[PDB]
Symmetry: C2
Subunit: 95 residues, 2 copies
């Protein structure tokens, strides 16, 4: 009889009911994932900020190392010059 | 019956709309998870680059201190030798 109809209507009502709950739960999971992505992005920006500072600082240090190397070379040459002056202090032309 | 045929066609249209919304939301969910996973990789990449740059800055600071010590040393040697000469 119309028993078949009542059963079909119940099935459809149950299915829509279930789908609504699944939809709400999936949307909630979506928003949770988006919340995680947002937080992660701030972490990325913070790391990028710190890396920029360190990259600049490393370059500054390399310039300073170069400056100091040049000074050590200069002072070593001055010491070497004094040693050579002593080495040659008795050297004359004899021919 | 007809009381059921109408109620059924409607409930069918609603089922389909909800199934469509669910699919869309699931797909957006997967995309958001991928954004989070990609971001996680970027974090690891940056953490490792930052660790190397921090370590480089430490090595370079050690070198700077060594060189500064050498400069002071040589400067004093030169001053002692210069005072000694013709005093």
């Amino acid at each position: 009889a119309c028993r078949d109809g009542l059963r079909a209507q119940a099935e459809c009502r149950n299915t829509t009911h279930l789908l609504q709950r699944q939809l709400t739960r999936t949307q909630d999971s979506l928003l949770q994932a988006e919340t995680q992505a947002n937080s992660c992005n701030l972490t990325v920006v913070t790391l990028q900020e710190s890396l920029e500072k360190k990259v600049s600082q490393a370059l500054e240090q390399q310039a300073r190392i170069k400056e100091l190397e040049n000074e050590v070379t200069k002072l070593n040459q001055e010491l070497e010059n004094l040693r050579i002056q002593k080495e040659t202090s008795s050297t004359v032309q004899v021919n």
